[model samples]
Target: SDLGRKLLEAARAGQDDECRILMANGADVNAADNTGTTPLHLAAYSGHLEIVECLLKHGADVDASDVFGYTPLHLAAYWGHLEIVEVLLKNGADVNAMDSDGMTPLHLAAKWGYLEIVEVLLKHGADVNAQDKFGKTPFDLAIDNGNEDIAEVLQKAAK
Candidate 1:
């Protein structure tokens, strides 16, 4: 618990130095805390470029889900961290990762008006036709959220 908790803190705070030290101490790279969130999840959401790369290099599970079924990419997109999104996607994070509510990364990006995020996700093969448990597509969310550019971008991609 000592070293693993430190590793978790290092990831959450973007403390790059401590990560290597903790890793060297045999910290489980895929350690999931009580919340089911791994260091990779915190690193991605915190927008730490090097930290995410470091964790991925050490065999972190990019697709590991939290208690809420939110993956690293899900939080990255939800919190408007595009660089993190690109980093994760490049490292093979599922572009179509969905949360408990059936919300994909694309759905979060589109709903929150991240035009940049939406396009990259599409280029990475995000399913344009994906529907949530409530039967809402990303396009529908964008339109409903008044994200005109996102809606148009999604429209082109879906068509």
Candidate 2:
């Protein structure tokens, strides 16, 4: 438990060296915090590319969801870390993963106006038509947020 907690902290702080050593000393790469947030989740959300890679190398679950069912991919997309999103996708993160609100990473990318992130998510096969808990699709979110560029891209994909 101590090692797991330490590794989680290490990952959250972007301490790649500590992450590596902690894992080597028997920390579980997939260990989650009280919120069901794994080291991968923290690393992904913080945009720590090297820590993400190290965690993945040690077998961190790419699709690991926190208490809200937000995966590493979700964090990367919402935070506009396009590169981290790519890494998670390439590592087998579920592109269509839904969080507690049924919002996909694409939804966050569109709503936040992360045009490049939206493009990458679409390319990775994110479901353009996926609806949220409120029956709003990613396209709806884009339009609502006035993310014209993303709305257009989503409109084109949905067709």
Candidate 3:
């Protein structure tokens, strides 16, 4: 239990060296905290590309969701970490995977007005018209959040 918590703390702090040591000492790469947040979740959320890759190499689940159903991809995209998003995508993360609210990484990217992330998701075949629990698509989210650039991108993708 201590090792698991330490591994998670190392991940959250982006301490790749510590994570490496812990993992080598038999820490579970997929060990989750109270909220079901895995080491990968903390690494990705903190924008630590090396930590993410390390965890992945050690068998972290790229699609592992937190208690709220937010995956590492969701957290990375939400934080505008393009490289992290790319890595997750390359590792087979679901481009259209939805959260508890039915919101996808596309929805988070568009909502945060991260045009580049939105483009990457679109390039990776994200659904332009995918809807959330509120029945709002990424385009609608962009528009509602006053992100015209993303709204336009989604609009063009829809066409």
Candidate 4:
């Protein structure tokens, strides 16, 4: 457990070598902290691509969610980390996976006006009409947030 905790901390801190060392020493790649945040969550949330790759190589749950049901892909999307999102997607992270609010990564990207992120998600098969608990789609969020470009993309997809 100590190694697990250390591995998590090292991941959050983006210490690449430390994460590798801890993992090589038998630390659990899927270990979750008290909040149910795994090393994969921290690594992806922090845009640590190497660490993400390492964890994934060592069998980390690519879609593992934290207490709030936010996955590594969700975090990467929220933060607008292009390569992180690309890596997660390539490694099989679900493009349409919803969080606790029923909001997918597409929703977050649209809300933040991250056009490239939205584009990338759309290219990866994200549902254009995916709705949240409030019945708001990514298009609704984008339009509400005054993001016409994103709304336009979603609009075309919705057709």
Off by over 4 Å in 1: none
lDDT by candidate, in order shown: 0.91, 0.91, 0.94, 0.93
**What would the per-residue lDDT of candidate 3 be over residues 51-146, giving only the tens digit for each residue?**
999999988898998889999999999999999999999999999999899999999999998999999999999998899989999999999999
- The list of candidate 2 runs beyond 4 A from truth reads none
Give lDDT: candidate 3, residue 65: 87
| lDDT comparing candidate 4 with the true structure | 0.93
Between the candidate structures 2 and 3, which one is better when assessed by TM-score?
3
Give all TM-scores, in the order shown: 0.96, 0.97, 0.98, 0.97
Which model, 2 or 3, shows the larger lDDT? Answer: 3
Error of 4 at 104 (Å): 0.3
For model 2, give the 10-residue run with minimal summed lDDT.
Answer: 58-67
Best by lDDT: 3
Tell me, by TM-score, which candidate is best: 3
Q: Relative to the unseen true structure, what is the C-alpha lDDT of residue 132 in candidate 3, on a scale of 0 to 100? A: 91
Tens digit of lDDT per residue, candidate 1, span 7-99? 998999999999988998899889889999999999988888899999999999989999898999999999899898998999898899888
Flag clash pairs in model 4: none
Cα RMSD for candidate 4? 0.8
Off by over 4 Å in 3: none
